[PDB]
């Protein structure tokens, strides 16, 4: 498979290049995708442009690692930045895409809430609970929960991060439990990982 | 610059079949530079390709299809090139099959190639359909509140729950809109239920906990339900 970092940041007029490991031939594609919009062909043959594609952008490969180089950052690079390939006979595979953040104000640490199950849901038999972030910049986090000291991987929706009116972001995760879990453990905990640094908070039944 | 657009059902039952079309526009799906396909991608999510195909024969053959090895037991892919038009069939779907899906043509060692093919690359996509695969009917929300404590420096953060409704959207406010300040809400997950749900938070002075009512005002046009959740100190 491809991996590449899930998040990558730079200032306008700085250069930057993001990483995929795991290519084994030349037939290595690069793909931008703004939000809410269709992915568009930046790079093919590792570095070939698409005709209109600006030549700020380029293609390169060293070992089994292909990168694209981004220089001159202009705000509407920002997007999600895909590699592609061809493997094994004729298939072809993506990587996990890295969101690229045009850096237009200070970095900042998340903010977090971790609500319990309340009292009406539990009397209706289900439970929730409620993870939510804010106040963060770049618009990127990872979440990951926990019960008592162990990870817990089902049951677990988090949105992708959403701009707040004060224009730095927030997300949201939700881990679902039976009220029977709920009550067996001693805590659970939400961790979000936000450049590297995380902030958790625990709750107890 | 040629074009595909893709038409179909955006509303497809679990475990029914998902059939999408594409329509090309300023190029041939006949000729023999390209392949035809597909990919998709769930919200939220990475891209994942589906497969592709050409009607350009070798000698051994009448044409070439590739398929995702994890889909091609449900999977069929077509052309017709009279009307250039490019079609999905996929059966049995689940809520892993949600996606924008995209029409795509490849691009790669097509027109010339040692031993077979090599479309490697997507040189033109569609703008893409989301396909919602649940089997849901229309279905108010439950909403539940999330209480702030009496006792984060002075602010407290409390917040609505809404849980379990279709289709989209629901909308909150909060006192009927005379709380705006510090109000945020949040996209809606489609749960493998099949079912959305989402949550609306706002940040407030600790201090007004015990003399400020908060309640918030949920609207779900589709269901025509309105919920006015009263949400309380703990």
């Known amino acids: 498979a491809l991996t590449q970092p899930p998040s990558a940041s730079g200032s306008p007029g700085q250069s930057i290049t993001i990483s995929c490991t795991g290519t084994?031939?030349?037939?290595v594609s690069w793909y931008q995708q703004h939000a809410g919009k269709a992915p568009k062909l930046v790079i093919y043959?590792?570095?070939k442009r698409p005709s209109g594609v600006p030549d700020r952008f380029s293609g390169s490969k060293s070992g089994n690692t292909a990168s694209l180089t981004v220089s001159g950052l202009q705000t509407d690079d920002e997007a999600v930045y895909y590699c592609?390939?061809?493997?094994?006979?004729?298939?072809?595979?993506f990587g996990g895409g890295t969101k690229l953040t045009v850096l237009g104000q200070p970095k900042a640490a998340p903010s977090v809430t971790l609500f319990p199950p309340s009292s009406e849901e539990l009397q209706a038999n289900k439970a929730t609970l409620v993870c939510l972030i804010s106040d963060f910049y770049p618009g990127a986090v990872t979440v990951a929960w926990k019960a008592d000291s162990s990870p817990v991987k089902a049951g677990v929706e988090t949105t992708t991060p959403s701009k707040q009116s004060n224009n730095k972001y927030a997300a949201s995760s939700y881990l679902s439990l039976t009220p029977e879990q709920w009550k067996s453990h001693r805590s659970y905990s939400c961790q979000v990982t936000h450049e590297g640094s995380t902030v958790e908070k625990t709750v107890a039944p | 610059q040629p074009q595909l657009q893709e038409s179909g059902p955006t509303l497809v039952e679990a475990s029914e079949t998902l059939s999408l079309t594409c329509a090309v526009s300023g190029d041939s799906t006949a000729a023999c530079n390209s392949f035809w396909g597909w990919v998709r991608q769930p919200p939220g999510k990475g891209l994942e390709w589906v497969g592709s195909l050409s009607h350009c024969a070798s000698y051994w053959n009448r044409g070439w299809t590739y398929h995702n090895p994890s889909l091609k037991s449900r999977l069929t892919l077509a052309l017709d090139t009279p009307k250039n038009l490019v079609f999905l069939k996929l059966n049995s779907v689940t809520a892993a099959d949600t996606a924008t899906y995209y029409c795509?043509?490849?691009?790669?060692?097509?027109?010339?190639?040692?031993?077979?093919?090599?479309?490697?690359?997507?040189?033109?996509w569609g703008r893409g359909t989301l396909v919602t695969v649940s089997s849901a009917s229309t279905k108010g929300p439950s909403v539940f509140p999330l209480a702030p404590s009496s006792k984060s420096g002075g602010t407290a953060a409390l917040g609505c729950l809404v849980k379990d409704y279709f289709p989209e959207p629901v909308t909150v406010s909060w006192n009927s809109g005379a709380l705006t300040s510090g109000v945020h809400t949040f996209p809606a997950v489609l749960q493998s239920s099949g079912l959305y749900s989402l949550s609306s938070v706002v940040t407030v002075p600790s201090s007004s906990l015990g003399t400020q009512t908060y309640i918030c005002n949920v609207n779900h046009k589709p269901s025509n339900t309105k919920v006015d959740k009263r949400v309380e100190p703990k």
């Open positions: 795509a043509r490849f691009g790669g060692e097509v027109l010339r190639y040692t031993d077979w093919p090599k479309p490697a690359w997507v040189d033109l």
């Open positions: 592609g390939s061809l493997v094994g006979n004729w298939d072809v595979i």
């Open positions: 084994s031939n030349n037939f």
């Open positions: 043959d590792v570095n």
